[PDB]
Design an enzyme around this catalytic site. Sequence first.
Site, short mmCIF file in Angstrom:
data_model
loop_
_atom_site.label_atom_id
_atom_site.label_comp_id
_atom_site.label_asym_id
_atom_site.label_seq_id
_atom_site.Cartn_x
_atom_site.Cartn_y
_atom_site.Cartn_z
CG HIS A 15 -2.17 -0.82 1.12
ND1 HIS A 15 -3.42 -0.28 0.90
CD2 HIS A 15 -2.35 -2.16 1.26
CE1 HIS A 15 -4.32 -1.25 0.89
NE2 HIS A 15 -3.70 -2.40 1.10
CG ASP A 112 -4.37 2.97 1.44
OD1 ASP A 112 -5.53 2.51 1.41
OD2 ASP A 112 -3.36 2.35 1.06
CG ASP A 358 -8.10 -7.11 -4.23
OD1 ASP A 358 -7.43 -7.83 -3.47
OD2 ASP A 358 -7.57 -6.34 -5.06
O1 U2F Z 1 9.25 -12.07 -4.09
C1 U2F Z 1 8.58 -11.03 -4.27
C2 U2F Z 1 7.22 -10.96 -3.94
C3 U2F Z 1 6.53 -9.76 -4.18
N1 U2F Z 1 7.18 -8.71 -4.72
C4 U2F Z 1 6.43 -7.45 -4.98
O2 U2F Z 1 5.42 -7.18 -3.99
C5 U2F Z 1 4.21 -6.69 -4.58
C6 U2F Z 1 3.02 -7.60 -4.27
O3 U2F Z 1 1.85 -6.83 -4.55
P1 U2F Z 1 0.37 -7.45 -4.71
O4 U2F Z 1 -0.62 -6.32 -4.79
O5 U2F Z 1 0.35 -8.45 -5.83
O6 U2F Z 1 0.21 -8.41 -3.40
P2 U2F Z 1 -0.04 -8.07 -1.84
O7 U2F Z 1 1.01 -7.15 -1.28
O8 U2F Z 1 -0.40 -9.33 -1.07
O9 U2F Z 1 -1.39 -7.23 -2.05
C7 U2F Z 1 -2.28 -6.75 -1.07
O10 U2F Z 1 -2.68 -5.46 -1.54
C8 U2F Z 1 -3.12 -5.47 -2.91
C9 U2F Z 1 -3.26 -4.03 -3.39
O11 U2F Z 1 -3.80 -3.26 -2.31
C10 U2F Z 1 -4.40 -6.32 -3.03
O12 U2F Z 1 -4.84 -6.39 -4.40
C11 U2F Z 1 -4.10 -7.73 -2.49
O13 U2F Z 1 -5.30 -8.50 -2.38
C12 U2F Z 1 -3.49 -7.68 -1.09
F1 U2F Z 1 -3.11 -8.94 -0.68
C13 U2F Z 1 4.47 -6.62 -6.08
O14 U2F Z 1 4.93 -5.30 -6.43
C14 U2F Z 1 5.60 -7.61 -6.27
O15 U2F Z 1 6.40 -7.30 -7.41
C15 U2F Z 1 8.49 -8.81 -5.05
O16 U2F Z 1 9.11 -7.85 -5.56
N2 U2F Z 1 9.19 -9.95 -4.80
O1 KMP Z 2 -3.48 -5.26 2.87
C1 KMP Z 2 -4.60 -5.82 2.90
C2 KMP Z 2 -5.57 -5.50 1.96
O2 KMP Z 2 -5.30 -4.56 1.00
C3 KMP Z 2 -6.80 -6.19 2.06
C4 KMP Z 2 -7.93 -5.86 1.13
C5 KMP Z 2 -9.23 -5.87 1.67
C6 KMP Z 2 -10.32 -5.54 0.86
C7 KMP Z 2 -10.09 -5.18 -0.47
O3 KMP Z 2 -11.13 -4.84 -1.26
C8 KMP Z 2 -8.80 -5.14 -1.00
C9 KMP Z 2 -7.71 -5.48 -0.19
O4 KMP Z 2 -7.02 -7.04 2.99
C10 KMP Z 2 -6.16 -7.36 3.86
C11 KMP Z 2 -6.47 -8.32 4.82
C12 KMP Z 2 -5.52 -8.68 5.78
O5 KMP Z 2 -5.85 -9.62 6.71
C13 KMP Z 2 -4.24 -8.09 5.78
C14 KMP Z 2 -3.93 -7.12 4.82
O6 KMP Z 2 -2.69 -6.51 4.79
C15 KMP Z 2 -4.89 -6.77 3.87
#
Ligand code: U2F
Ligand code: KMP
EC number: 2.4.1.115
Length: 439
Positions: A15, A112, A358
């Site tokens: 984020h 955010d 999501d």
């Molecule tokens: O080995 C690695 C592993 C990851 N990365 C980087 O970390 C980022 C992962 O972002 P992504 O939105 O796909 O996953 P996450 O952080 O779980 O997302 C949350 O937040 C998202 C956006 O708010 C939401 O869509 C999602 O549901 C949430 F879980 C992405 O930029 C990768 O390139 C990396 O560089 N090397």
């Molecule tokens: O980072 C997070 C996040 O973005 C979301 C998320 C929730 C609703 C949405 O519509 C999109 C994303 O859930 C989460 C749930 C967790 O337990 C921990 C997190 O860190 C996240």
Amino acid sequence: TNPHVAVLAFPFSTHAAPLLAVVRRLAAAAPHAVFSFFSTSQSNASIFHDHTMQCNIKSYDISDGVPEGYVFAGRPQEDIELFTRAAPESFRQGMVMAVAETGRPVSCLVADAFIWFAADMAAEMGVAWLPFWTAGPNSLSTHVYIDEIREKIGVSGIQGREDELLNFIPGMSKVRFRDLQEGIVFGNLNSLFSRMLHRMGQVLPKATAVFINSFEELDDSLTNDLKSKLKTYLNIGPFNLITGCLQWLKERKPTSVVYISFGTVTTPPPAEVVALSEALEASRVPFIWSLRDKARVHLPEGFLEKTRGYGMVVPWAPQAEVLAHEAVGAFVTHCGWNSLWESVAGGVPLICRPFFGDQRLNGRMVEDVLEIGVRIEGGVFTKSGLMSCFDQILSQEKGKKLRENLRALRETADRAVGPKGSSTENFITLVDLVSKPKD
Ligand SMILES: O=c1ccn([C@@H]2O[C@H](COP(=O)(O)OP(=O)(O)O[C@H]3O[C@H](CO)[C@@H](O)[C@H](O)[C@H]3F)[C@@H](O)[C@H]2O)c(=O)[nH]1
Ligand SMILES: O=c1c(O)c(-c2ccc(O)cc2)oc2cc(O)cc(O)c12
């Protein structure tokens, strides 16, 4: 005074980094404005790692909300709860410091979307509130429609109705009840996180403008619907099209390697970890697996030794660069928003295994709407299901079609961010909004 833009990050998962990325573009576009970036010390240390940073940006470390002698209960979302309960005060105290350092009152509040109370802080300060939705327009829509969805479906469960369609919401004709995020009509509706997102959904229509890392043309109807529900709605992405592993990849055949990663806050259950390992070994498919070091304990004995010749298991990969590499042919993913757009940038088909939030909406978009990836049979990793997905994508006609769809999608996205593109024009609008001094 000239503008002083306060930026309130959500310091968990992915984020703060995309928000800093926009702030960097804004600071270059509005060089007369000063920007103060608020997150926890751990978050800032991570995202500000490393002479290139715009001189008009300074970061400020705010409290993580954890009391000095606190002993964790070990709940899920406990860190989030602690941060969130303290955050109104934590951010206020940060902004006090930044106003004193700069000698400029805050003229604009970027935050955010998760920081829903930012709307109230902005109203108190008499400044514009500009929330950043860090995920996709699909999840934004369902959040903005929470009351109506709850009214239509009810809040006593969706048993027997999991595969019913959310077709009464514009742009959502292919989303099933089960695809919804937790906290809408299922999950713990009374949790702090669920209540946070409920209020957010209600107050977002009051924002000066809501901005998002997407492009309008991803879905015209969805875009039109959101512009009807929000005061101003600004698609300004995809950001990634605007702005050991690699050496290893150099020697692999084109479109031959499977990349695996589940984001920043997930590991599959141990049985699914076994299942993936079995599929990789049985196919002898070249692979790079981003897996938390702590989770390596769950790999079958002998797996690392048998796969040493053709696969890497690493705690962190340079993911965007790996996905852009010609050797990579598929991406096993949790369907997080940022990962998806990096795969699109690389032209790599997805194998979707969504967990939470999501990710199910994103999986639905990928599989049924854009057709740029495939589903895993039953939504869980099995050895046979994964082997089938690898074959479909790497060796069969299905993969050629997915690659074609990805090319077309990426071209559209590219044009949105080029000269005269919709995201380009929207970004100018956002620059204009952050450039306004205080009333
Ligand atoms: O080995 C690695 C592993 C990851 N990365 C980087 O970390 C980022 C992962 O972002 P992504 O939105 O796909 O996953 P996450 O952080 O779980 O997302 C949350 O937040 C998202 C956006 O708010 C939401 O869509 C999602 O549901 C949430 F879980 C992405 O930029 C990768 O390139 C990396 O560089 N090397
Ligand atoms: O980072 C997070 C996040 O973005 C979301 C998320 C929730 C609703 C949405 O519509 C999109 C994303 O859930 C989460 C749930 C967790 O337990 C921990 C997190 O860190 C996240």
